[PDB]
Amino acid sequence: MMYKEPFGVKVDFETGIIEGAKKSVRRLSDMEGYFVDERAWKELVEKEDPVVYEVYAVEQEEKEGDLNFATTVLYPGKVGKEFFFTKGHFHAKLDRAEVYVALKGKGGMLLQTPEGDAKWISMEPGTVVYVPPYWAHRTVNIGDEPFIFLAIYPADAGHDYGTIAEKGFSKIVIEENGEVKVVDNPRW
Amino acid sequence: MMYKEPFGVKVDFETGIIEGAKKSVRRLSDMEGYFVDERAWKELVEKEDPVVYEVYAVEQEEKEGDLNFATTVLYPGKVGKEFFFTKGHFHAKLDRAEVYVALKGKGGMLLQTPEGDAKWISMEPGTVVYVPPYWAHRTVNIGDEPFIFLAIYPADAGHDYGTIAEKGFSKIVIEENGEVKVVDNPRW
Numbered sequence A, B: 001m002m003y004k005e006p007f008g009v010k011v012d013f014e015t016g017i018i019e020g021a022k023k024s025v026r027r028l029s030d031m032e033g034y035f036v037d038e039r040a041w042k043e044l045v046e047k048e049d050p051v052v053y054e055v056y057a058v059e060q061e062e063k064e065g066d067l068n069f070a071t072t073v074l075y076p077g078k079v080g081k082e083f084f085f086t087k088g089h090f091h092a093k094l095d096r097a098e099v100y101v102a103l104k105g106k107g108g109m110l111l112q113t114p115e116g117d118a119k120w121i122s123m124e125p126g127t128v129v130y131v132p133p134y135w136a137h138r139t140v141n142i143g144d145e146p147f148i149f150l151a152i153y154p155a156d157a158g159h160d161y162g163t164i165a166e167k168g169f170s171k172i173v174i175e176e177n178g179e180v181k182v183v184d185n186p187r188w
């Protein structure tokens, strides 16, 4: 019988690094067509192209019942008024749920159905978020320090980026008049 | 179609409490036939019947792709020389994996396959443990404060307590001459 070996790994809740994980870097230039203010995007890319977020992922083969986990370090920033966020995605197998545990910083999650019905959940250290089957999810950094969290997801969930890539979320998170606001996407 | 509502909840990393969750308590009286020293067990039940652990569970219906999560507060203690532990279980759907995130205290996990081969993984705050498909899993508190962790598991995993209830784990975790030891279970 083939059994896989249990393992433990240290996650630094201060940095989000998992040593030995598959590390992914997303710079702002990897995020064309994601932010409402297209000229601000282009300008911040030309002037800096900052890292928006980094992922440390521990992934299994795509098998039903098995589980992947990953930390994300989402860096502080705005493109125009719109706070830095993850690209966001549905799962390829839509009915797969997810669990997030917020570890550090201040942020939130934007979630939406295949119909564009939308929800915002605040996240501070210790907030666990239940992402139900069929909800697209995007995390947002609303602070001045990195927003770091752990996600645990079905190993066979997969990723569906395309739909969010072209249409976006139906709601957006901005800093307007010194205040964090979740408002309608004026482009959806 | 019908979509369940996303929610966040605060987990308290000092106490392991999740408000609104399904609370479960195990006292030593709930653990007959688990510990090597049955007379110690009997005396301690008759004297104090202490809490061994508390569970705070957020559970979905048993459906493929969906996820549950729960914290456990494993109290410090010994039955004779043997550190306080959880009952331990395989999943009813045997191939369902599990992810644990250690939050407070000091301990570890005993894992074993249906064959009976056992692994011990140390857990400190920040340790994430991957429990693979087919591994029974028990957590052990080897410290002097609650050992506190969050478990994320497939909603359809279920629990299979029976085999572990009857025969235990092939390894025990004991304190002997001021030293934590993982040794073969004499009753195996």
Ligand SMILES: O=C(CO)[C@@H](O)[C@H](O)[C@H](O)COP(=O)(O)O
Binding pocket: A055, A070, A071, A072, A086, A087, A088, A089, A098, A137, A138, A139, A151, A153
């Ligand atoms: O949803 C899970 C599983 O993949 C997360 O670990 C995100 O993948 C990560 O926060 C980066 O964001 P995306 O670019 O994947 O939206």
Ligand SMILES: O=C(CO)[C@@H](O)[C@H](O)[C@H](O)COP(=O)(O)O
Binding pocket: B055, B070, B071, B072, B086, B087, B088, B089, B098, B137, B138, B139, B151, B153, B159
């Ligand atoms: O493995 C997961 C799934 O439920 C944990 O939440 C344990 O259920 C908990 O630590 C109590 O341990 P048991 O009494 O179920 O072995």
Ligand SMILES: [Zn+2]
Binding pocket: A089, A090, A091, A098, A137, A153, A157
């Ligand atoms: Zn996901």
Ligand SMILES: [Zn+2]
Binding pocket: B089, B090, B091, B098, B137, B153, B157
């Ligand atoms: Zn389990």
